[model samples]
Target: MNIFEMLRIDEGLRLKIYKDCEGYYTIGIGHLLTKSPDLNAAKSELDKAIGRNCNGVITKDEAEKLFNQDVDAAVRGILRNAKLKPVYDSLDAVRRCAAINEVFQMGVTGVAGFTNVLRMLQQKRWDEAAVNLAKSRWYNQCPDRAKRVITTFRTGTWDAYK
Candidate 1:
């Protein structure tokens, strides 16, 4: 499956503000407004995107717009990383989507911290990569999504799309 489709299923959509697993004020397809350095500016943008004060409601269109932007940022974050770029380029589309999903859930720096996992992935050691990824705190916190991503990395297929 494509990145958008996979993420839509994995992250799930929320039209109203809710506390994420980390208790961040999140909305719109896992967008974490509370994480923004400029919280006011982020809220302002949220208001404009939803065409309201954003008192806890958003339309599907607005949520979709935010999702697209977030996905773009995640993809760009991966590509801009000096260490991640070459490894990312070496991956096929399915594996690339898995990489993007990891970045989407965490951030570039967070995924970059997977040094051993990155090495295994760079060497095309899919099983080893999966093993190393499973040892991460991310896997402990989000086992379902992590399993899907790990499977993608291991098999280089879209079998986890459902």
Candidate 2:
């Protein structure tokens, strides 16, 4: 399965905004509230768009619609980031998707800070990119995810980690 599908399966649909085991405000799928400073700003905008706070409930269909829409927009945002252009254009589709997934977790500005990794990617130094990415704080935040994304970057396979 593709990375997006795998993510959807892992983060099952939630019609209502609810707290997870950690008691964070979460809605849609696994989209955590206040996950970053910009995210709270985005949440405020989302509330303006939806006419209420994200903590309210919606139908399953609405939830899926919103999730897909948000993800698609995030992908577009990643592609448009000037700093990511070389890696965005050079990687194979699955790898590109995986890269976009990192941008999804970390906003474009967040992921754009991986200068050395992007430099390696621009040079087509896949192994070096993986190594550099592994050393990042982003990697430390979620080792499994770092493994998955870096493996995909090196191997050009959606299921590289698996």
* Candidate number achieving the greatest lDDT relative to the actual structure: 1
lDDT by residue (105-146, candidate 2, tens digit) is 666887898888888887879889888888877677666545
Q: Rate the local accuracy (lDDT) of all candidates.
A: 0.83, 0.69
lDDT of 1 by residue, 10-88 (tens): 8798887766664456787888776655556566756866667976678888888889999999999988998789899
Whole-model lDDT for model 2 versus the true structure? 0.69
List all candidate RMSDs to the true structure: 2.6, 3.9
TM-score of each: 0.88, 0.74
Ten-residue segment with the worst summed lDDT in candidate 2?
A: 16-25
lDDT of 1: 0.83
Off by over 4 Å in 2: 9-25, 32-49, 52-56
* Model 1 alpha-carbon drift over 4 Å, by segment: 36-45, 48-51
